[PDB]
Design a protein around this nucleic acid. Sequence first.
RNA 1: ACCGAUAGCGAACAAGUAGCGUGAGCGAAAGUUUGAAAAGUACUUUGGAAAGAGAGUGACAUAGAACCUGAAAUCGUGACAACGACAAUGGAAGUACCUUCAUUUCUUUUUUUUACGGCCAGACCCAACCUCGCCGCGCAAUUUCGGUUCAACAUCCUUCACUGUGCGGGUUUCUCUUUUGAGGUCAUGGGGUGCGUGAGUGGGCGGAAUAAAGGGUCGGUGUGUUGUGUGUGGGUUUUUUCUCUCACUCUCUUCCUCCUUCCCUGUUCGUGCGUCUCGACGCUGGCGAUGGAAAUGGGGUGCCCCCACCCGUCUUGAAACACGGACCAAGGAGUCAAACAGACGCGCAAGGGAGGAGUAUGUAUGUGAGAACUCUUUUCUCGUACUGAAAGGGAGAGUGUGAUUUUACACCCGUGGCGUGCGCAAUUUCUCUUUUUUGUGUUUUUGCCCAACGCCGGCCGGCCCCCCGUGGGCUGCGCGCG
RNA 2: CAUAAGAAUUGAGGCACCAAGUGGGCCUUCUUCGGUAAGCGGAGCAGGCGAUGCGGAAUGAACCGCUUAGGGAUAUGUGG
RNA 3: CGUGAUUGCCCAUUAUUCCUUUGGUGAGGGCGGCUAUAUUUCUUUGUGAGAAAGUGUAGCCCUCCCGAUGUAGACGUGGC
Lengths: 158, 48, 70, 128, 192
Amino acid sequence: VHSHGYKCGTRHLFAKKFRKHGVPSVSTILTNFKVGDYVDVVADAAVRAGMPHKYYHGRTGIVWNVTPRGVGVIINKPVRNRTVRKRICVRFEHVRKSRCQEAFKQKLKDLEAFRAAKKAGTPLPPKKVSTRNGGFVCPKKVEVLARRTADYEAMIPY
Amino acid sequence: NRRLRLRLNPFQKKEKAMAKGMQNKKNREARHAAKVVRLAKARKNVAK
Amino acid sequence: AKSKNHTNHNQSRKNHRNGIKPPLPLYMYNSKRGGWLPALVNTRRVRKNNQKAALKARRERLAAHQAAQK
Amino acid sequence: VFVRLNKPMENMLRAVEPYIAYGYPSLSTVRAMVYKRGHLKINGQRVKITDNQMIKDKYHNDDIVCAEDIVNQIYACGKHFRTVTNGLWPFKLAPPAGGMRQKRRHFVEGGDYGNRDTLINRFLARMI
Amino acid sequence: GVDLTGVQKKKRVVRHHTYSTNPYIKLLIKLYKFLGKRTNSPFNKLIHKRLLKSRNNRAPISLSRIAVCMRRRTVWLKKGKKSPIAVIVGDVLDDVRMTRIPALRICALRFSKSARERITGAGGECLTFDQLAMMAPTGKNTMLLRGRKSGRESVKHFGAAGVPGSHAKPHVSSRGKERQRSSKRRHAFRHK
RNA sequence: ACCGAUAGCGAACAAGUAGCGUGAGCGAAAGUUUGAAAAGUACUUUGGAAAGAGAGUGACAUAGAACCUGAAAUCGUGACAACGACAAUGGAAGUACCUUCAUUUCUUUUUUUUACGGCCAGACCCAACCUCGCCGCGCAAUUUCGGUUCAACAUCCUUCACUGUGCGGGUUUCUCUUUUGAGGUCAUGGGGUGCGUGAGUGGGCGGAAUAAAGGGUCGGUGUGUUGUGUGUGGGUUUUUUCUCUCACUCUCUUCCUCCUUCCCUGUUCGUGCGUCUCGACGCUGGCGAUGGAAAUGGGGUGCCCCCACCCGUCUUGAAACACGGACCAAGGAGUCAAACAGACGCGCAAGGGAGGAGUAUGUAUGUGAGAACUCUUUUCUCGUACUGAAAGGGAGAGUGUGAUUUUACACCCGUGGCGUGCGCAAUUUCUCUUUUUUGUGUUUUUGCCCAACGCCGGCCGGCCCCCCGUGGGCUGCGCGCG
RNA sequence: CAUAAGAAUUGAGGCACCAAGUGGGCCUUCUUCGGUAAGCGGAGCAGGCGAUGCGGAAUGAACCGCUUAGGGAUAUGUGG
RNA sequence: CGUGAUUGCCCAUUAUUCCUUUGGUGAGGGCGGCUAUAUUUCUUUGUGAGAAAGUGUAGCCCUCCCGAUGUAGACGUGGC
């Protein structure tokens, strides 16, 4: 059985990788928040505080909190027969807003905007096509296949 | 069970009564078809 | 005869007996506890407020019995 | 069962091939299922079908009334496909004087499994 | 080839060839069972059903919590309907808090002596459900009182890894100082 | 509200005996004639003798002192018309034998077998699932060398093969052009019967349709036409001239060399025809078998076919070469019981439970009933706020209200989320009712829970430099409408 | 809640009380460690067996097929 | 020619189907003081013979439905 640091390491994961070294950007810091955001978790390294244990990068949870430097994310962690919500104390630097949800809503409103426009706003306005289908065809030059060995002396392994 | 069958299609009895068109009718088709294609056939011809 | 340790098999089968639960997650509302104290202080001041909404749950009651009681 | 087809749904079926046979029903056949194993599920109770009033009683609601709507709804869908189907009672066919053999797997890749497409009718018919 | 049952042959749960030893009930149920189903009345049915349970499952209700109900009348209508029907499948116990509260009509299993009286005496009315139903078929301006449940003590004795989340009182032997409670009310021994 | 002679004391018995052990001590086994009684079998007679056989007694000796009964294991016998490749008993199955049970029965009754609407399934017989298209075919043609003959030539063609001409007559469309359609095919069943009230056997006469026909009409399509136009991209085209048309694309052309809708002009097919139909229900009969004995149906043994490993148990796994298990009686193992958790019935309910006791008066043994009846003042006891080690405090911090809410007022829901419910409107019919159905409203978080104050004790005493007040601010088996 | 365009399900969900019986496993497709190896050892996944029989593999705990009311009638399974 | 001799099969507790059984958070109903509902069935293409014909029918009865192997272990009995 194995050794256990709460920050017990790995091979090639935590290490800060391919030209991706160094501090978080100021863009990172310019960000802005509100709570309830569904944001995803990543690990810089940078400061080895506010830094989750292993579970958590690549997972999406929801923020419940914004503290000075940091934000609270409750995440559902799967134990036995359940997922428990865990509320984790990160400083802001280790988390980011997805698109996961964004689209859904985005579309939903956009669509509504259109659906609404379409009735009950002014205009009227084509989008898409159906799915997939049949068709007339006037092709104009079919081929076939003849494979391997003819002129194999030109090619193949030795 | 014409009855439930008939519930489900009532044209069916009359279909059944009249075979949905028997034999004379069933042998008649081809022969038109056969010439007819030839008429169709015939058209493209020269215009190639 | 080497005396085996332990394992995990059967488990997802066991785990799936009784399933994989979350609980109506956001209960309808949170599970309580914690936060940033300057925010928490402020939120109480906008829940001060509750005695206002209790007199809005009484505003309607008065309207029904002052319009007419007939 | 009957299946509405669009890409996932093409996909769930896509995975499942050596466990299933599926393909393209025929109107004859459809009708015929509609005979043989014709049932509706009716607040439960699995009941072999009888009449277009019940059908309407369940499916007046998509202004279906009869099986010919149903079959129509099968071949020609409606997207009340779902709706129609779900109230079905599940079809149970027959042993079929035409085993599967080669110790299973797909048609070309075995026995039989996979999509018998139009050949499903051909197949299915001995099985109903 | 059968396949998963979501639990096979579906468990007592809410029950059938049924409960306690009081004769009357047995009638009641016969009476009422027709009524909810075959006098299509959710209320009746409800009644019917509601009749069926066990004592816990009929933990009482008491009066002042009805007061409120007769504040409801008061924010109901200007008042064409001007009447209201209380139900409790238990005994009505007296409360205390008010006890100068008005009269009114309550439809119960049992009213305490005192209560019964005093209620009635206050112009109230204690009607048994025979005294209800019959002369009350169908709801409408009925008020189900669904009892309580909660404030039993039993649940108290649910919980003890005394984490900051679990705050609950064990079935233990101190009835006084220590005798199994030495810290927690001090942070220190055997921590939290 | 005990045990029943292996029980029950050790000991129902001359038992704490007998017995046993040096001794200490250890310390058993062991029940019943008589409807009434010995009336306890005289007598005969054989028999050494026992004894026997008789007899004799007695209801009964299958009661003769082994006495009530007399279980099982085990064995003789009788009796057996019972059977045997050889495991053995075993399943299953049927027959034979059967001791067999129970049932029903004919000159108008049963019984085995035929037979029977509509049904109510299953199998046969013929039709077709279309179709654009090759394929080919034919011709000619080239190439193209083979059978004839002894071989060559005929017979460049036996033909495979090619290439061109020409054709549209002709197989593909396989248990894939349906997996189509009914016609009786009459063989199979593992039968078959009973709502009703009744518009009504309504319907069933067109309906169908290859199609011929006719185009026409518009409509769908490949093309030539581009009729373009659009697209411009390349060249020793900065640019302009010049050259390549390539890519697209418009109408167009209605080119079609092309579909189809419609509508006419055929054919078919059935129902029509006529309206009667009718398509929404067979213990019966025919076969042979008593007339009080049987017979149909049920029990038992044997026998044959097939089928098919010792139980229990421990184990990962036991048919093992794991253990225990020769047999039959009678024994022979999950108890009483506190606090306590749930469940449930059960009582009453903030009280409840007495409870210890004690009194208490006749039913009449008794009596002035642990147990009868109780019956109970005092209450006792637990319960009907909790919190603090404490010292100690302590809950409508009601609600509401004023409120600069020490206070002071008022006095029939703390704040939100949910709520069987109740309300309203639309919604169906119904006279109206009923009121189906719709559409909503609304309402205490004691209906449940959630979610947030609030509240008690608690703790830090906050805010602030420190401390106090507007007011804090951490915490707990607390409190929030008994 | 349409797209003009891209589910299916959902023989209920919610929710809970409380007590058992269990903790030696073993077998397998798959991955994989130790060691030559081992019907060996030792893990990972899924499935079994265990704790089920039926039907198949002349023979088999775990292979094939398939699981089971009691039957009846029919047809298949694996397998012939 | 165009198929057709004509019918390639044999055989599990699976499957269908069918019956009876059984349980079920199962479905129905009739559950009336003569309209009706079960029992028994004719005369037997459109009958409950309320009146052809005997018998039963007080909250249960009478129809319907899904499911139905299970060790340990548990629970149940209008079980013994």
